[PDB]
Amino acid sequence: SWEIDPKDLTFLKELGTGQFGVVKYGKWRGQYDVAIKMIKEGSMSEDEFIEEAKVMMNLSHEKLVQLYGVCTKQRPIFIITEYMANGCLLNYLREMRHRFQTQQLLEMCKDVCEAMEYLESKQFLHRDLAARNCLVNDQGVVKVSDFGLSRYVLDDEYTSSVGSKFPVRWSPPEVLMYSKFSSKSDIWAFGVLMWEIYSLGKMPYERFTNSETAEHIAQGLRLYRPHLASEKVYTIMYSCWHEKADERPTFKILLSNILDVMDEES
Ligand SMILES: Nc1nccn2c([C@@H]3CC[C@H]4CCC(=O)N4C3)nc(-c3ccc(C(=O)Nc4cc(C(F)(F)F)ccn4)cc3OC3CC3)c12
Ligand SMILES: Nc1nccn2c([C@@H]3CC[C@H]4CCC(=O)N4C3)nc(-c3ccc(C(=O)Nc4cc(C(F)(F)F)ccn4)cc3OC3CC3)c12
Numbered sequence: 001s002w003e004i005d006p007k008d009l010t011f012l013k014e015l016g017t018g019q020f021g022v023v024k025y026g027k028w029r030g031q032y033d034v035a036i037k038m039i040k041e042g043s044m045s046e047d048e049f050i051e052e053a054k055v056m057m058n059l060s061h062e063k064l065v066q067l068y069g070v071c072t073k074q075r076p077i078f079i080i081t082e083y084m085a086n087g088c089l090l091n092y093l094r095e096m097r098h099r100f101q102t103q104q105l106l107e108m109c110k111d112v113c114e115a116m117e118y119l120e121s122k123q124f125l126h127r128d129l130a131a132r133n134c135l136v137n138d139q140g141v142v143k144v145s146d147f148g149l150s151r152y153v154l155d156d157e158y159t160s161s162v163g164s165k166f167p168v169r170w171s172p173p174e175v176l177m178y179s180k181f182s183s184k185s186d187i188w189a190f191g192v193l194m195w196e197i198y199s200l201g202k203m204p205y206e207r208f209t210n211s212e213t214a215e216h217i218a219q220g221l222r223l224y225r226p227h228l229a230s231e232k233v234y235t236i237m238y239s240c241w242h243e244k245a246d247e248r249p250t251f252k253i254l255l256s257n258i259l260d261v262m263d264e265e266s
Pocket of ligand 2: 067
C-alpha cells in the first residue's frame with residue numbers, strides 16, 4: 001504494501017484545509033487524478049492510524065471514497081484517494097445556486113446509505129458520520145469518507161462527549177450519556193445527515209448550543225421536519241432517532257425505505 005512512492009505525485013492545485021490536513025489535487029505517474037491529503041503533524045496516533053489505513057485499503061464500494069495508498073516514509077504522512085471534484089457535501093448543500101430537486105436530495109441520502117450498508121457488512125463503524133465527511137464527485141455522486149478515523153485523533157476536544165469538537169449534534173443519547181458506540185449510533189448519525197441534506201446544510205439544532213442539544217435529546221426531543229422533506233422522508237430520518245437503539249432500523253432497511261419513497265415520490 002500500500003505504499004505509493006511520493007515521487008510519483010504531481011501536485012496541481014491546492015484544495016484548501018480540510019479536517020486534519022491540507023489536501024491537494026494532483027496526478028499519479030503523470031496520468032491518474034488523485035487527491036493527496038497531508039495528515040497534520042501531531043494530530044493522529046500514527047502507528048495505529050497507518051495500520052488501520054492499510055487494512056482499509058481492502059475496502060471498495062462505488063459510494064465510498066476509494067483509498068489508493070499511503071506515503072508513510074516521511075512526515076507529513078500522505079493519504080492518496082479518489083479525487084472528488086465537487087468537494088465536501090456540506091459546502092455543496094450550502095450553495096443555493098444548485099437549486100436541488102428533492103429527488104436529487106433523496107439520491108444523496110441513498111448514496112450515503114449504500115456506503116454505510118457496505119461498511120456495516122464489512123464490520124466497520126463510521127463513528128463520525130456527518131455531511132462534513134462526505135464528498136461529491138464531478139457527476140454529483142456523494143461518497144462517504146473518514147470512516148473510523150476519529151479513533152486516532154489525539155486532540156481531547158474531539159474525543160469525548162464533554163469536548164468542544166465532539167459531534168454532539170450527530171450523537172444518540174447512549175453516546176452522550178455513556179459512550180455506547182454501535183451500528184445504532186451510526187444509524188442515528190445517518191438520520192441527522194439526511195436532515196442536513198434536506199435542510200441544505202443547516203447546522204443540526206442550529207438555534208442551540210452543544211450543551212442545550214444534549215439536554216434536548218436527554219428530554220426525548222428531536223430535530224423536526226425540514227421544509228424540503230415530505231412526510232415519508234421525514235418518517236425515514238425520524239426512525240433513526242428512536243430512544244431505544246434496538247428499535248432503530250438497519251442500513252439495509254433504510255435503503256429499502258428510501259427506494260420505496262423514490263418510487264412513490266417526485
Ligand atoms: N478526496 C478529495 N477530493 C476532493 C476534495 N477533497 C477534500 C477537500 C479539502 C478542503 C475542503 C475545503 C472545502 C472542500 O470542499 N474541501 C474538501 N478533502 C478530500 C479528502 C481527501 C482524503 C480523505 C481521506 O484521507 N480519507 C480517509 C482516509 C482513510 C485512511 F486511509 F487514512 F485510513 C480512511 C478513510 N478516509 C478525506 C477527504 O475529505 C474528507 C471527507 C471530507 C478531498
Ligand atoms: N482495493 C480493493 N479491495 C477489494 C476490492 N476491490 C475492488 C473491486 C473490483 C471488482 C468490483 C466488482 C464488485 C466490487 O465490489 N468491485 C470492487 N476494486 C478495488 C480497487 C479499486 C481501486 C484501486 C486503485 O485505483 N488503486 C490505485 C490507484 C492509483 C491511481 F492511479 F489512482 F493513482 C494508484 C495506486 N493504486 C485498487 C483496487 O484494488 C487493487 C488491489 C489494489 C478493490
